[PDB]
UniProtKB/TrEMBL annotation, chains A, B:
The keyword Protease applies. It is a lipid-anchor. Keywords: Aspartyl protease, Host endosome, Hydrolase, Protease. GO terms for molecular function: aspartic-type endopeptidase activity. Residues 20-89 form the Peptidase A2 domain. Pfam families: RVP (PF00077). GO terms for biological process: proteolysis. The keyword Protease applies. Gene3D superfamilies: Acid Proteases. Transmembrane segments: none annotated. One of its GO terms (cellular component) is host multivesicular body. This is Protease. The gene is pol. It is found in: Host endosome, Host multivesicular body; Virion membrane.
Length: 99, 99
């Protein structure tokens, strides 16, 4: 799809078998989801945003279907204000900015 | 133009008498610029993201050129670690996400 930016670019994702809403976020390096359970091993990590650093759990090689497009990659879980799809997965689904 | 997301989508912007590098950020409702001493009236505001909130100064109807595209709108100024072009200006320059 082509998505204009008058509204937040929120899309439905499927991850760990469950549907969630998430923000397509070109200003995010990484994909960060609100507190949830995911299978497998994770590693403690820290990331910075506006207003400082948080602790997250890093899950590697996690499949997510983003608006009907398949990705498999790193998913961080922690106290983000909203579920965000970052560049690591935006690139996988062929997402570009155009003007 | 088309901008892929392998790296941060940083572009040159012009505001006041200053050229700066700023993120084209679909995840940002607002445009947030690093500390700069702009003339004119402003209103205090708080904005938040991953690591919590920061204090900013809200300036309205500020002309800003992004990648040679003119825009005019609200600019928040404060201790952000990166210059952020939010959806309020991305819409003005005709920016879309596409996949
Ligand atoms: C490893 N770090 C990241 O991936 C950054 C994730 C992030 O917080 N991105 C911000 C933009 C940003 C990038 C780098 C440093 C600081 C900020 C995101 O794209 C825009 N934010 C809102 C989205 C998290 C929901 S925001 O907090 O910066 C913002 C922008 C305007 C008002 O708030």
């Amino acid at each position: 799809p082509q998505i204009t930016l008058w509204k937040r670019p929120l899309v439905t994702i499927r991850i760990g078998g469950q549907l969630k809403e998430a923000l397509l976020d070109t200003g995010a390096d990484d994909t960060v989801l609100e507190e949830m359970n995911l299978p497998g091993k994770w590693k403690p990590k820290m990331i910075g945003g506006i207003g400082g650093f948080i602790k997250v759990r890093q899950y590697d090689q996690i499949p997510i279907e983003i608006c009907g497009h398949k990705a498999i990659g790193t998913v961080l879980v922690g106290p983000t204000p909203v579920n965000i799809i970052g560049r690591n997965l935006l690139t996988q689904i062929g997402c570009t900015l155009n003007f």
